[PDB]
Amino acid sequence: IWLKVCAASDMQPGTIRRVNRVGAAPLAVYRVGDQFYATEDTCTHGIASLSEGTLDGDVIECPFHGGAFNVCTGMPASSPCTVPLGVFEVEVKEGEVYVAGEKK
Numbered sequence: 088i089w090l091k092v093c094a095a096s097d098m099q100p101g102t103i104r105r106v107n108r109v110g111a112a113p114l115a116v117y118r119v120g121d122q123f124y125a126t127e128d129t130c131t132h133g134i135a136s137l138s139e140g141t142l143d144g145d146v147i148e149c150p151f152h153g154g155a156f157n158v159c160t161g162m163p164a165s166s167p168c169t170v171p172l173g174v175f176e177v178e179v180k181e182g183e184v185y186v187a188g189e190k191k
């Protein structure tokens with residue numbers, strides 16, 4: 088199940104895009120350089136949107152507590168985060184960014 092995100096050219100490096108899913112929590116797609124990554128958009132430490140946070144390199148900083156995760160692995164990058172984010176495969180076909188609707 089692949090969800091159409093947007094045209095690669097529509098995402099500037101260092102930006103984030105929220106992607107809604109049917110019957111599930113939304114995802115966040117991050118563009119690091121020319122690479123694209125995706126994780127659950129919701130922080131595992133609280134009800135917070137990571138796409139509303141700060142992407143520093145390939146680490147997304149949560150809007151709260153100073154928490155952070157690596158967007159490639161979904162692993163916590165800073166306290167108080169301890170639970171890894173689910174990661175989702177991203178693929179670019181003909182300039183269009185697609186994200187898997189199912190975790191990997």
Ligand code: FES
Nearest residue numbers: 130132133149154
């Ligand atoms: S809600 Fe995100 S680190 Fe606490």
Ligand SMILES: [Fe+3]
Nearest residue numbers: 138139140150
């Ligand atoms: Fe905002």
Ligand SMILES: [S]
Nearest residue numbers: 103138139140
């Ligand atoms: S935003």
